[PDB]
Design a protein around this ligand. Structure first.
Ligand SMILES: CC(C)n1nc(C#Cc2cccc(O)c2)c2c(N)ncnc21
Length: 822
């Protein structure tokens, strides 16, 4: 059985556990040891949780950032239900007392024993919050549906919990021996090295002699460095580039100069190199695993007598403000002199001072650290900054995790994406960020859910395979039940990948009706119906994907021929009628990120009382150029609506009418105004989000509308202006805002306000978006690479100007956009 588990993990994580031993690497060993233990202690705790505490682990609350409503409640072991009238202000408990009072009458005769389930979902309503505060009641009110819930008893939830059981001496210059290499090229070879502490180098770089592009090369030279050894900061990273010349790059490689156990390194090292596009401090510090086909440099670290980085005990012994909101040489000096007054009077300026400290003078690091040890904790926003590669020092990083523990789960969920990329910044395997992420992930099943997919989705990337594999194993050890649930998911994705391949081939030999019919047959096979049914949606674990409606599944006509898969649930009703789209052949990362940034805007907007009726649909990469998109139902592209067909509700005299005629046929009588309002509001959000993010190549095929009026965008392969992308106002939306009328500045100008509010709200959190993109640089995304891309955001938010100017500027942009509307 111990064998079984091991083998299911191997299958889950897409790499086999045997490959971890094979390496004969004790760092991997220790990581595997320490992390298993830690994780197992987390599951121990979980099986003693109170029933309510268990619910908070497994089904965390889905909350919003007087008036009457109708609710259906029912009990578990019965089909009989009651419909109570209540107030949106009422707590869940009030409902639960109704229900039981009704039960005790029809059945002829204790609220807190209970939680309410959303029917057909992994979703529960509990806590002291007005019904209307829950996303589910909230949502129910817009669409006009009546919430449906089930009284679940404490014994029934405990039954669930149950089921789920498992030093200063050395003053001479630093040097290595460059010895030999083993690749091929066209013309002379040369090497280049520099000692880096993150971005900043710690001395001028040095070089090789010229060696003809021959071998198999052999240098046997001490490369000597412009820095004394006793100065090397703890996170000294030594970086090599190998290229050729008469500039043509070939390979790079980095290593940490101390091992993971603080011991400085000697003697000889063989270096398996990574392929080129010249010196790459940001690259990983682990060798290329394709040792067969890769160039391997050999070097010799010269045993300097063991030696350890000194323990913290030892380190403990050993016109200001105007600039303080990129500073000159002297400006830096003042800051450093004032460092105690910075700690005492401006603790939030920690970062600007870290960047002034002299990472290549050991004495100064010792003093900086000495301050950091009594530095007050910082706001979440400031902590997010300290995580950047600009702050390699492990003592700073630890302080940043410390400051970040106060992240709520919802906040944590919000920035999870970037915290995983940051892992790519880590120099060793056992690190503060990992324990944190795994700890928080073992405390919340939703966090656990997404950490795992973020990790699984990158197992094809050689530079991260081992790091991520090791983490997913650890999670598994501390959550056997959840591992079974995710295999269920991966098994489904496995089938879609085979089904999607069939469809690509098929669709090149035959007609779309013919191919759809074969898909349906292939899906009807026992192995498929079994693998595609009765799972949690990898896009949102609280969504249950029950029986797949084969007759309703099909495929899109785009290049990669993505799949459209529908699902139903008798137990959830019309709420269990959800759909997912499988796509294989494209990078979904960029789209995912884009979608997370919109969702965040909507959060920030909502927090200031502005609801722009956004449609933040799920989009989740799962594997190599594979992942999942959420089906938004009851929607159609602008392009389709505008085909202006015959024998349709919507055919007018003028192509400009069609889209409004469409809103009309979906919304009879009085209800047309609501839809125009939902259209106007969402239209403003998308105009701002696309403008702020530099998204372009909007056109009527990749914009959609829901029957409610809500407009939203799909298919984002381009942001940050990577084809200055102008703000866009499309004439036919403008026509819808203006309720069909030629002139209507009352409706058109309310629309401008929506835009200006939305825009100015995001400037207030400009720095949260700058920090988040700074951390996304670790993703390797082609369109998020250098400083020019972040500048793009600097300029779109006018984050350097006062709010008078930015708003004035924005107003010129919007006007310009109007000119372009006919
Ligand atoms: C109607 C078609 C065009 N369509 N396409 C939809 C879609 C997509 C998508 C989103 C981001 C990236 C990407 O490549 C594709 C879609 C959806 N999500 N919900 C409802 N209908 C949808």
């Amino acid at each position: 059985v111990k064998k079984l588990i091991n083998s299911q993990i191997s299958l889950l994580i897409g790499k086999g556990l045997h490959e971890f031993d094979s390496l004969r690497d004790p760092e991997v060993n220790d990581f595997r040891t320490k992390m298993r233990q830690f994780c197992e202690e987390a599951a121990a705790h979980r099986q003693q949780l109170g029933w309510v505490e268990w619910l908070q682990y497994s089904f965390p609350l889905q909350l919003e950032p007087n008036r009457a409503l109708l609710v259906n409640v029912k009990f578990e072991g019965s089909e009989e239900s009651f419909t109570f009238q209540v107030s949106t202000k009422d707590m869940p408990l009030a409902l639960m007392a109704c229900a039981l009072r009704k039960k005790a009458t029809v059945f002829r005769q204790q609220p807190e024993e209970y939680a309410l389930q959303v029917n057909g979902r992994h979703e529960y309503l509990y806590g002291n919050y007005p019904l209307c505060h829950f996303q589910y009641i909230c949502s129910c009110l817009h669409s006009g549906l009546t919430p449906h819930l089930t009284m679940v008893h404490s014994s029934s939830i405990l039954a669930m919990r149950d089921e789920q059981s498992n030093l200063w001496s050395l003053e001479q210059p630093f040097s290595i021996e460059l010895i030999e290499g083993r690749k091929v090229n066209a013309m002379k070879l040369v090497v280049q090295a520099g000692l880096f502490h993150g971005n900043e180098m710690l001395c001028k770089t040095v070089s090789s002699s010229e060696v003809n592009v021959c071998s198999e090369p052999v240098w046997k030279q001490r490369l000597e460095f412009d820095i004394s050894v006793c100065d090397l900061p703890r996170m000294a990273r030594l970086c090599f580039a190998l290229y050729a010349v008469v500039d043509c790059p070939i390979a790079w490689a980095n290593l940490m100069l101390f091992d993971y156990k603080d011991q400085l390194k000697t003697g000889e090292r063989c270096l398996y190199m990574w392929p080129s596009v010249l010196l790459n401090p940001a690259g990983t510090v682990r060798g290329n695993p394709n040792t067969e086909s890769a160039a391997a440099l050999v070097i010799y670290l010269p045993e300097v007598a063991p030696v350890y980085f000194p323990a913290l005990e030892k380190i403990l012994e050993l016109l200001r403000e105007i600039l303080e909101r990129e500073l000159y040489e002297h400006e830096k000096d003042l800051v450093w002199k004032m460092r105690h007054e910075v700690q005492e009077h401006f603790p939030e300026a920690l970062a600007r001072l870290l960047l002034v400290t002299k990472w290549n003078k050991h004495e100064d690091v010792a003093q900086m650290l000495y301050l950091l040890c009594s530095w007050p904790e910082l706001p979440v926003l400031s902590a997010l900054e300290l995580l950047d590669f600009s702050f390699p020092d492990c003592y700073v990083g630890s302080f940043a995790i410390k400051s970040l523990r106060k992240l709520t789960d919802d906040e944590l969920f919000q920035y999870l994406l970037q915290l995983v990329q940051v892992l790519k910044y880590e120099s060793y395997l056992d690190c503060e960020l990992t324990k944190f992420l795994l700890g928080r992930a073992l405390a919340n099943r939703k966090i656990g859910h997404f950490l795992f997919w973020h990790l699984r989705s990158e197992m094809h990337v050689p530079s991260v395979a081992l790091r991520f594999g090791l983490i997913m194993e650890a999670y598994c050890r501390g959550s056997t039940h959840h591992m079974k649930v995710l295999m269920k998911q991966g098994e489904a994705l496995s089938k879609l990948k085979a089904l999607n391949d069939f469809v690509k081939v098929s669709s090149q030999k035959t007609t779309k009706p013919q191919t759809k019919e074969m898909m349906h047959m292939c899906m009807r096979q026992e192995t498929y119906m079994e693998a595609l049914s009765h799972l949690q949606s990898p896009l949102d674990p609280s969504t249950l994907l029950e029986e797949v409606c084969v007759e309703q599944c099909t495929f899109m006509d785009s290049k990669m021929k993505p799949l459209w898969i529908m699902y139903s649930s008798e137990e959830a009703g019309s709420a269990g009628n959800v759909g997912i789209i499988f796509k294989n052949g494209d990078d979904l990362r960029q789209d995912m990120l884009t979608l997370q940034m919109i969702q965040l805007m909507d959060v920030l907007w909502k927090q200031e009382g502005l609801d722009l009726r956004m449609t933040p649909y799920g989009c989740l990469p799962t594997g190599d150029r594979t992942g999942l998109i959420e089906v938004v139902l009851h929607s159609d592209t602008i392009a389709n609506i505008q085909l202006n067909k015959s024998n349709m509700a919507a055919t007018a005299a003028f192509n400009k009418d069609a889209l409004l005629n469409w809103l009309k046929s979906k919304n009879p009588g009085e209800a047309l105004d609501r839809a125009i309002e939902e259209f106007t509001l969402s239209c403003a959000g998308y105009c701002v989000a696309t403008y702020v993010l530099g998204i372009g190549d909007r056109h009527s095929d990749n914009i959609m509308i829901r029957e409610s009026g809500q407009l939203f965008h799909i298919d984002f392969g381009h942001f940050l202006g990577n084809f200055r992308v102008p703000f866009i106002l499309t004439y036919d939306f403008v026509h819808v805002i203006q309720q069909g009328k030629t002139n209507n500045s009352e409706k058109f100008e309310r629309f401008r306000g929506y835009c200006e509010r939305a825009y100015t709200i995001l400037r207030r959190h400009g720095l949260l978006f700058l920090h988040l993109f700074a951390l996304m640089r670790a993703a390797g995304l082609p369109e998020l690479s250098c400083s020019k891309d972040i500048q793009y955001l600097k300029d779109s938010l006018a984050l350097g100007k006062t709010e008078e100017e930015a708003l004035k500027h924005f107003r010129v942009k919007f006007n310009e956009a109007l000119r372009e509307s006919w």
